[PDB]
């Protein structure tokens, strides 16, 4: 009665049935299911590697079948950039992927705001391109004690010349002679003719902009396949029939769990409805199919004689069983609390629903 | 972080001998396995390196034909043998975590011989 | 190859030491690493990456080098700091020294 009078924001309360709240099943348990994966992502290998891959010819390593533990990344002191797109790197942490790519390569200082996605220039366009919806992270350290050389370490090369700009995840390693005019070369160098990789200066006295840097794009995809990697993961046991929050696979939300009838083909993971919301799963551990359903919900109505009459009330709560609400009468309209049903037959005095109404006697 | 291995054994020339390598404390599929050895009064000598992850296997120039390692993942374990013993075989041989070469891609890493076992030794007397 | 010097270095406790390791080629300095042992016991990492300190290793080790010619050294012996050192390399295949 005093959710009624808060509702109505009236301190007096006329005859009637008030919605005054919804109801809601809540969560009895979470249950967390991922991927059984027993080998580590081989990160280690890809970032302490003693040499790494010149701009122009980056060298890509797969990363698959494993689980991949990000906090020792986000969290080191070592990178002096750690720029992610699409994704948090706190967040990373419990995702899933169907497939990892390591790209690496070593660039001077003032190009590495050229790796990031819609970025233009020498290195974005002729030795490294990223797609505009790139979905990843961008790691980079500076090698200045690893990579640099007192007489120079013209080992590192880059790109200088091409004809047109790199399209995303592009590799061109040709040496052929660029003809910058209108004469041609003959594979020789000269006026107009000149090799299209440059050398970089890299010594260890050279400054912040112009000294080396290593650096590490993990690229993240995922297709509607089996994941391969997935972050630290937890994983609990299976519940059925009863109200749980879930995580599949990274999958994250609430609802009933069951066994379901639907004849998924071998390569199905998910099912999706109308409203883009996924109400079907494949277990990642046991490939059983589950239905999911949220828990019961719904609006809860106060019937009521005016205040000035009683303070006595009924509540209905619609669209369900009296078995799940926690004077019980099932009705066509839900189950309602609080009133006396009987056998007689009077005018309709508060309507209720489906041949039902209220009154007080 | 622990490795430990087998017991001294005593050989004939002309046999072969296997030593074993447990290891734990730590991803056994993320470190390969290296081994070394060191007769009486002699400095280190290398025998080779293996993945634990893929089976992959590298040798010193001296071992080739004669030393054969394997790896139980299952186990977590690592085997060296050593075939067609010698007199100056008389040795310890040692166990190490190795960081100095990838498990998964097998290229050359910043690192070394991280966490080493107890050493077998191996005498090889008729 | 690697040559170390000198093969056995004389001093007393409290003094600084200095360990010298040479290469045959050049080596780059992603791929080497110093080693201890002590008597009746296995080897122990001290340096690896040529100038990166081991896990667990006192503030007393320390190194550096570049091309042919690294080193080690430690600011002040302790009494077990008297043990046999040596480097290695795996820039290419994979080599020790003789030890000091």
């Known amino acids: 009665l005093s959710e009624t009078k808060c509702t109505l924001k009236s301190f007096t309360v006329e005859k009637g049935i008030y919605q005054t709240s919804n109801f809601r099943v809540q969560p009895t348990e979470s249950i967390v299911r991922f991927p059984n994966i027993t080998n580590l992502c081989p990160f280690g290998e890809v970032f302490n590697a003693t040499r790494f891959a010149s701009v122009y010819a980056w060298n890509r390593k797969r990363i698959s079948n494993c689980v991949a533990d990000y906090s020792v990344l986000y969290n080191s002191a070592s990178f002096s950039t750690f720029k992610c797109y699409g994704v948090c790197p706190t967040k990373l942490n419990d995702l899933c992927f169907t497939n990892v790519y390591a790209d690496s390569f070593v660039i001077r200082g003032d190009e590495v705001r050229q790796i990031a996605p819609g970025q233009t220039g020498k290195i974005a366009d002729y030795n490294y391109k990223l797609p505009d919806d790139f979905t990843g992270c961008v790691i980079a350290w500076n090698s200045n004690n690893l990579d640099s050389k007192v007489g120079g370490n013209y080992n590192y090369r880059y790109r200088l010349f091409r004809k047109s700009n790199l399209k995303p995840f592009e590799r061109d390693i040709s040496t052929e002679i660029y003809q910058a005019g209108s004469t041609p070369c003959n594979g020789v160098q000269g006026f107009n003719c000149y090799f299209p990789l440059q050398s970089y200066g890299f010594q260890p006295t050279n400054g912040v902009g112009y000294q080396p840097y290593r650096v590490v794009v993990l690229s993240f995809e995922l297709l509607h396949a089996p994941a391969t990697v997935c972050g630290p993961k937890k994983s609990t046991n299976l519940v059925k029939n009863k109200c749980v929050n879930f995580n599949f696979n990274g999958l994250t939300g609430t609802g009933v769990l069951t066994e379901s009838n639907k004849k998924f083909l071998p390569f199905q993971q998910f099912g999706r409805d109308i409203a883009d919301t996924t109400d079907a799963v494949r277990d990642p551990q046991t490939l059983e199919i589950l239905d999911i359903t949220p828990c019961s919900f719904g609006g809860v109505s106060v019937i009521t004689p005016g205040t000035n009459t009683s303070n006595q009330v009924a509540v209905l709560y619609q669209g369900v069983n009296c078995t799940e609400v926690p004077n019980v009468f099932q009705t066509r309209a839900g189950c309602l609390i609080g009133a006396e049903h009987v056998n007689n037959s009077y005018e309709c005095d508060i309507p209720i629903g489906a041949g039902i109404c209220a009154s007080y006697q | 972080v622990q490795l430990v291995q087998s017991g001294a054994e005593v050989k004939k020339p002309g046999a072969s001998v296997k030593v074993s390598c447990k290891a734990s404390?730590?991803?056994?599929?993320?470190?390969?396995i290296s081994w070394v050895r060191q007769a009486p009064g002699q400095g280190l000598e290398w025998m080779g390196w293996?993945?634990?992850?893929?089976?992959?296997?590298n040798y010193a120039q001296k071992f080739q034909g004669r030393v054969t390692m394997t790896t139980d993942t299952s186990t977590t374990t690592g085997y060296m043998e050593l075939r067609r013993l010698r007199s100056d075989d008389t040795a310890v041989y040692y166990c190490a975590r190795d960081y100095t070469r990838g498990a998964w891609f097998g290229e050359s890493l910043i690192g070394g011989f991280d966490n080493w076992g107890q050493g077998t030794l191996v005498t090889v007397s008729s | 190859v690697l040559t170390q010097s000198p093969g056995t270095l004389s001093l007393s406790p409290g003094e600084r030491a200095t360990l010298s390791c040479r290469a045959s080629?050049?080596?780059?300095?992603?791929?080497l690493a110093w080693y201890q042992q002590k008597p009746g016991q296995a080897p122990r990492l001290l340096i690896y990456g040529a100038s990166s300190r081991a896990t667990g290793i006192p503030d007393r080790f320390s190194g550096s080098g570049s091309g042919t010619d690294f080193t080690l050294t430690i600011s002040r012996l302790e009494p077990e700091d008297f043990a046999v050192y040596y480097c290695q390399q795996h820039d290419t295949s994979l080599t020790f020294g003789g030890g000091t």
């Open positions: 293996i993945s634990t992850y893929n089976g992959n296997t």
């Open positions: 080629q050049t080596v780059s300095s992603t791929s």
């Open positions: 404390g730590y991803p056994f599929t993320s470190y390969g």
